[PDB]
Write a protein that binds this ligand. Structure first.
Ligand SMILES: [Cl-]
Lengths: 106, 106
């Protein structure tokens, strides 16, 4: 029920769990219409999930901060996950992620 | 094993998995000496892990990008996870995260 622990599915999709996609700093930007509708039921979810960090890696790799704003107290995070450009699936992986980044603008 | 899927423990600690804490863009900044050396064996690891995102929430909550540089092709990410200041453990949660944020500077 805490937002960060939700898992979107067709029965409880990306908008229900995580809000509409959009350009504001408080919004997620990732997902075309079918990923939004299907969440982890999406046809290529495992190929996306392979880039998501474990809890240990989330706190080990990221730059972590905290911010107390008018809306509340936030744990902030930024980081980058390196793709293997030698993987024979590398080009497909780039295509897959680009299909969903800022897809709401199309 | 791909870095984002690693789990640090006493036998394979945060440094071995995720590199030394530091100030640079490629470095994690989170963890005091105890957490670094113990990973998920750390005494308060569950109280930290409760803020890590599920794979679905990682891609649902974060602002996702991609960058190509001489150092590789990168999936970049940023976001903010709200704490519940109505939780009676809220203050101790803020204290715990603050203890580990940039602790390498102390
Ligand atoms: Cl998953």
């Amino acid at each position: 029920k805490p937002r960060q622990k939700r898992t979107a599915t067709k029965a409880y999709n990306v908008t229900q769990a995580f809000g509409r996609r959009g350009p504001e700093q408080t919004q997620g930007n990732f997902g075309d219409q079918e990923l939004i509708r299907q969440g982890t039921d999406y046809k290529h979810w495992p190929q996306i999930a392979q880039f998501a960090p474990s809890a240990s890696a989330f706190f080990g790799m990221s730059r972590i901060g905290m911010e107390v704003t008018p809306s509340g107290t936030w744990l902030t995070y930024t980081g980058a996950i390196k793709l293997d450009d030698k993987d024979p699936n590398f080009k497909d992986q780039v295509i897959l992620l680009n299909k969903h980044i800022d897809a709401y603008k199309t």
